C-alpha cells in the first residue's frame, strides 16, 4: 500500500482580490514597546476589515503585544513579522481563557493567521494564568493557521482546540483548513499542541511538541455526547514529531464514531512511543451537584449495569468493564457505546531512544523485559503534580503502542508501515499490544522522586 497524495487547494483556497491592507500599530494605535493590553486595537482592526465586501489583510509589525479573548471574523487575513512576541493579557476571573476564538460565537468564512520568515513567538513563561489555549475553533470554514513557536509553562488545555459550538439547537464545527509549522516547548503531559473534537477535511503538517502529545485525536467533548454530533472525518497529516513526551500521534475515540485518517512521516526522541492507539470506551461521570467518593460512584454504577461492570473510578470518572455483556447494558440504560475510527493508515515511523519520556502507570510493567530493576524511572513530587500516579518520567518503551480490543466486536484498527527504532537497549519492545506479556518490576509510589531539573526540563 502507498499513501494518497493531495494538494494545498484541496483544503484551503486563498482570496484572489481584497479591499484593504492595514497596520495594527500605524492605523489602529497598538503599542509594541510597552507591557499594556492591545486587544481593543486588534478587535477594531478585525471588525473594520470584515465590514468591507472583499475583506483584507492586517500586518502585526515587530514588537511585543498583549491579547486575550479576540473574536475573529470573515474575510480577515493576518500576517505577523519574524521578531514579534505575543503574550496573554492578564485576566483574573478564574475562567478558561484563549488568546483567539474563531467561529465560537458567530459564523466565520475565509480566514488566515500566518507568521512571516522563520516564525514568531507566543510566550506563556511570564504568565500567572494556568487555563490558557492559543486558538479555540468553532463554526469556521476555509482557513489557515501557520508558522510560530509556543514557549509553554505547563498550562492546562492543548494549544489549538479544533472544537464544536452550539447554535439553533444543534452543533457546528470546522471544515476545509490547514494547521502547520508550529513548535511547542515545555507542555504538560495531559495536553500538548493539537486536540481534535469536531472536524472535516483538515490537513496538519510540520508540528512538534516537547512534552505531552503533538497531534491528539481524542474526541471526548461532553457536548458531543449529548447531541450525538461531531467527530472527525477525512483528516490528513505529515511530519509530526514528539520529544520528551507521551507520543507524536495518538488516537482515542472515547464514545464517538469517527471516520478516516492518513498520516505520513512520524518521529520521536525520548517519548513513550511514536504512535499510540487507545480502545474506545464508555465512561460515566458523577454529577457535580451530588457528593461522592471513589467507592461511592463505583457502587452507584454497578447498581445499574451489574456487579463487576465498573472499573475503579479515577479523578470522578467510572469506565465500564470491557465485556460485551456489560457494554450491552450500558447502551440500554444510558444510550452510549464505545467509539471508533474508520480506516486509519500510518506510513514511515522512526523512534529514537532516550531516558526522559512521559509515561503512564499502566505502561510501567512493560519494562520487565529490558529493565527488570526499573532503573532511571522517577515519580514527580507532590509539588510538581499533586495527583501522584498520573505521570512518571523514564526510558522510552516502544515504537508503537496499540491497546484496541482485537478479539472484540467493538474493535477498530490502526495500521503502521515501515517502523524503525534507534539506540534502544537489548530486549526492548517494538510494538506493544493487548497480547504483549508484562510483569510488575517498578515501585509505583515508593520509587525515587524526580529532581526539579528533570521535571522542569
Ligand atoms: O488515591 S490514590 O492513592 O491515587 O490511589 C492509587 C490508584 O489511583 C491512581 O490510578 C491511576 C494512576 O494514578 C491515578 C490514575 O491515573 C489515571 O488512570 C486512568 C485509568 O484509566 C487513566 O490511565 S490510562 O488508562 O493509562 O490512560 C488516566 O489517564 C487518562 O485520563 C484521560 C483519559 O485518557 C487520557 C486522559 O484524557 C489519559 O491520560 S493521558 O492523556 O496523559 O495519557 C490516568 O491519569 C490515580 O488515581 S487518580 O484519580 O488520578 O488520583 C488507585 O487506582 C489504586 O487502587 O490505589 C492507589 C494507591 O493505593
Ligand atoms: O470549552 S471551555 O469552556 O473552554 O472548557 C469547557 C469547560 O469550561 C466551561 O465550563 C462552563 C461553561 O462555560 C464556562 C463554565 O461556566 C467554561 O469554563 S470557564 O471559562 O472557566 O467559565 C471546562 O471546565 C472543561 O474542562 O472543558 C470544557 C470543554 O468544552
Ligand atoms: Ca501593548
Ligand atoms: Ca517591519
Ligand atoms: Ca523569528
Ligand atoms: Ca485493533
Ligand atoms: Ca481488527
Ligand atoms: Cl485540551
Ligand atoms: Na524559548
Ligand atoms: Na494550555
Q: Where are the beta strands (DSSP E) in 45-131?
A: 56-60, 64-67, 70-71, 76-80, 85-88, 97-102, 108-115, 120-123
- Cell readout for 131 is 487555563
| Ligand 8 (single-atom ion) residues, CB below 5 Å | 157-158, 195
Taking the C-alpha atoms of residue 313 and residue 324, their distance in angstroms, rounded to an integer, is: 19
Distances (CA, A) of 18 to 45, 53, 79, 333: 15, 9, 14, 55
Measured from the Cα of 223, ligand 2's closest atom is: 30
| Cα–ligand 2 centroid distance for 278 (angstroms) | 25
| Cα–ligand 3 centroid distance for 184 (angstroms) | 24
Contact in structure between 145 and 114 (CB atoms under 8 Å) = yes
Contact in structure between 285 and 316 (CB atoms under 8 Å) = yes
| Cα–ligand 7 centroid distance for 369 (angstroms) | 26
- Which residues are CB-contacts of 82 (< 8 A; sequence separation ≥ 6)? 62, 115, 116, 117, 118, 119, 120
Main-chain phi, psi angles of 431, to 5 degrees:
-125, 130
| Cα–ligand 9 centroid distance for 149 (angstroms) | 8
* CA-derived radius of gyration, the chain: 23
Specify the DSSP element, H or E, that contains 250: strand 247-252
Number of domains the chain contains: 1
Specify the DSSP element, H or E, that contains 222: helix 222-227
The sign of the CA dihedral 40, 46, 49, 50 is: negative
Domain CATH number, residue 446: 2.160.20.10
Residue nearest to atom 37 of ligand 1 (CA): 190
The sign of the CA dihedral 93, 95, 101, 104 is: negative
Taking the C-alpha atoms of residue 122 and residue 261, their distance in angstroms, rounded to an integer, is: 29
Taking the C-alpha atoms of residue 145 and residue 134, their distance in angstroms, rounded to an integer, is: 11
Residue nearest to atom 15 of ligand 2 (CA): 95
Answer whether 236 contacts ligand 1 (Cβ < 6 A). Answer: no
DSSP conformation class of 314: B
Q: DSSP states of 137-204 as a string?
A: E-SEEEEEEEEEEEE--S-BS-SEEE-EEEETTEEEEEEEEEEEEEEEES--TT-EEEEESEEEEEEE
Of the candidates 232, 179, 177, 224, the one whose C-alpha atom is nearest the C-alpha of residue 205 is: 179
Taking the C-alpha atoms of residue 391 and residue 325, their distance in angstroms, rounded to an integer, is: 32
| Cα–ligand 7 centroid distance for 220 (angstroms) | 22
In terms of residue numbers, what domain contains 315? 1-457
Contact in structure between 174 and 103 (CB atoms under 8 Å) = yes
Contact in structure between 4 and 234 (CB atoms under 8 Å) = no
- Which residues are CB-contacts of 345 (< 8 A; sequence separation ≥ 6)? 1, 3, 261, 262, 263, 415, 417
Buried b / exposed e across 186-220, counting CB within 10 Å, b at 16+? bbbbbbbbbbbbbbbbbbbbbbbbbbbbbbbbbbe
The sign of the CA dihedral 370, 375, 380, 381 is: positive
- Cell readout for 367 is 519494562
- Cell readout for 279 is 480502545
- Which residues are CB-contacts of 222 (< 8 A; sequence separation ≥ 6)? none
| Cα–ligand 5 centroid distance for 64 (angstroms) | 13
Answer whether 316 contacts ligand 1 (Cβ < 6 A). Answer: no
Taking the C-alpha atoms of residue 350 and residue 411, their distance in angstroms, rounded to an integer, is: 26
Of the candidates 318, 328, 324, the one whose C-alpha atom is nearest the C-alpha of residue 283 is: 318
| Cα–ligand 5 centroid distance for 137 (angstroms) | 25
Specify the DSSP element, H or E, that contains 135: strand 132-137
- Cell readout for 89 is 493579557
Specify the DSSP element, H or E, that contains 264: strand 261-269
Q: In a mutational test of the pocket of ligand 1, which residue from 361, 365, 382 has the highest number of ligand atoms less than 8 Å from its CB?
A: 361
DSSP SS3 for 213: strand
Measured from the Cα of 246, ligand 1's closest atom is: 43
The sign of the CA dihedral 35, 147, 230, 332 is: negative
DSSP SS3 for 411: coil
Taking the C-alpha atoms of residue 185 and residue 154, their distance in angstroms, rounded to an integer, is: 9
Residue nearest to atom 53 of ligand 1 (CA): 312
- Cell readout for 320 is 465500564
Distances (CA, A) of 205 to 107, 113, 116, 237, 253: 25, 15, 17, 6, 21
The sign of the CA dihedral 142, 147, 148, 149 is: positive
Ligand 2 surroundings by CB, under 6 angstroms? 95-96, 221
Contact in structure between 334 and 344 (CB atoms under 8 Å) = no
| Cα–ligand 10 centroid distance for 133 (angstroms) | 5
Distances (CA, A) of 313 to 125, 292, 305, 326: 34, 11, 15, 16
Answer whether 387 contacts ligand 1 (Cβ < 6 A). Answer: yes
Task: State the distance between the two ends of the chain, measured CA to CA, in whole angstroms.
Answer: 40
Quick one: which ligand is closest to 162's CA?
Answer: 8
Taking the C-alpha atoms of residue 246 and residue 264, their distance in angstroms, rounded to an integer, is: 19
Which residue do the cell numbers 524511572 mark?
Answer: 377
Instruction: Report the length, in residues, of the chain.
Output: 457
Contact in structure between 101 and 71 (CB atoms under 8 Å) = yes
Taking the C-alpha atoms of residue 108 and residue 94, their distance in angstroms, rounded to an integer, is: 28
Answer whether 315 contacts ligand 1 (Cβ < 6 A). Answer: yes
Answer whether 403 contacts ligand 1 (Cβ < 6 A). Answer: no
Residue nearest to atom 3 of ligand 2 (CA): 96
Answer whether 362 contacts ligand 1 (Cβ < 6 A). Answer: yes
- Cell readout for 293 is 467518593
Amino acid at each position: 500500500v502507498s499513501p494518497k497524495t493531495y494538494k494545498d487547494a484541496d483544503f484551503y483556497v486563498a482570496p484572489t482580490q481584497q479591499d484593504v491592507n492595514y497596520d495594527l500599530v500605524d492605523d489602529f494605535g497598538a503599542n509594541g514597546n510597552d507591557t499594556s493590553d492591545d486587544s481593543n486595537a486588534l478587535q477594531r482592526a478585525i471588525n473594520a476589515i470584515s465590514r468591507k465586501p472583499n475583506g483584507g489583510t492586517l500586518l502585526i509589525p515587530n514588537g511585543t503585544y498583549h491579547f486575550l479573548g479576540i473574536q475573529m471574523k470573515s474575510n480577515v487575513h493576518i500576517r505577523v513579522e519574524s521578531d514579534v512576541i505575543i503574550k496573554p493579557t492578564w485576566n483574573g476571573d478564574g475562567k478558561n481563557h484563549r488568546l483567539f476564538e474563531v467561529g465560537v460565537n458567530n459564523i466565520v468564512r475565509n480566514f488566515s493567521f500566518q507568521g512571516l520568515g522563520n516564525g514568531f513567538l507566543v510566550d506563556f513563561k511570564d504568565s500567572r494564568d494556568k487555563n490558557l489555549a492559543v486558538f479555540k475553533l468553532g463554526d469556521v470554514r476555509n482557513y489557515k493557521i501557520s508558522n510560530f513557536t509556543i514557549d509553554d509553562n505547563k498550562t492546562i488545555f492543548a494549544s489549538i482546540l479544533v472544537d464544536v459550538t452550539e447554535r439553533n439547537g444543534r452543533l457546528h464545527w470546522s471544515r476545509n483548513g490547514i494547521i502547520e509549522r508550529i513548535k511547542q516547548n515545555n507542555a504538560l503531559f495531559g495536553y500538548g499542541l493539537i486536540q481534535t473534537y469536531g472536524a472535516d477535511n483538515i490537513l496538519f503538517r510540520n508540528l512538534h511538541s516537547e512534552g505531552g502529545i503533538a497531534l491528539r485525536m481524542e474526541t471526548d467533548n461532553l457536548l458531543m455526547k449529548n447531541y450525538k454530533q461531531g467527530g472527525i472525518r477525512n483528516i490528513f497529516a505529515d511530519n509530526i514529531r514528539c520529544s520528551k513526551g507521551l507520543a507524536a500521534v495518538m488516537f482515542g475515540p472515547h464514545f464517538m464514531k469517527n471516520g478516516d485518517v492518513q498520516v505520513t512521516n512520524v518521529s520521536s526522541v525520548s517519548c513513550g512511543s511514536a504512535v499510540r492507539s487507545d480502545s474506545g470506551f464508555v465512561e460515566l461521570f458523577s454529577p457535580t451537584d451530588e457528593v461522592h467518593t471513589r467507592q461511592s460512584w463505583k457502587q452507584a454504577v454497578e447498581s445499574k449495569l451489574g456487579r463487576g461492570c465498573a472499573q475503579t473510578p479515577y479523578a470522578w470518572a467510572a469506565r465500564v468493564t470491557q465485556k460485551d455483556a456489560c457494554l450491552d447494558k450500558a447502551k440500554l440504560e444510558y444510550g452510549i457505546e464505545p467509539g471508533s475510527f474508520g480506516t486509519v493508515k500510518v506510513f514511515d515511523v522512526t523512534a529514537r531512544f532516550g531516558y526522559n519520556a512521559d509515561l503512564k502507570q499502566d505502561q510501567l510493567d512493560y519494562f520487565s523485559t529490558s529493565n527488570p530493576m526499573c532503573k532511571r524511572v522517577c515519580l514527580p513530587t507532590k509539588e510538581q503534580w499533586s495527583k501522584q500516579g498520573q505521570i512518571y518520567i523514564g526510558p522510552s518503551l516502544a515504537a508503537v503502542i496499540d491497546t484496541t480490543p482485537e478479539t472484540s466486536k467493538y474493535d477498530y484498527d490502526v495500521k503502521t508501515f515501515n517502523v524503525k527504532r534507534i539506540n534502544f537497549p537489548v530486549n526492548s519492545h517494538k510494538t506493544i499490544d493487548t497480547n504483549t506479556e508484562s510483569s510488575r518490576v517498578c515501585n509505583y509510589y515508593g520509587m525515587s522522586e524526580c529532581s526539579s531539573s528533570r521535571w522542569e526540563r
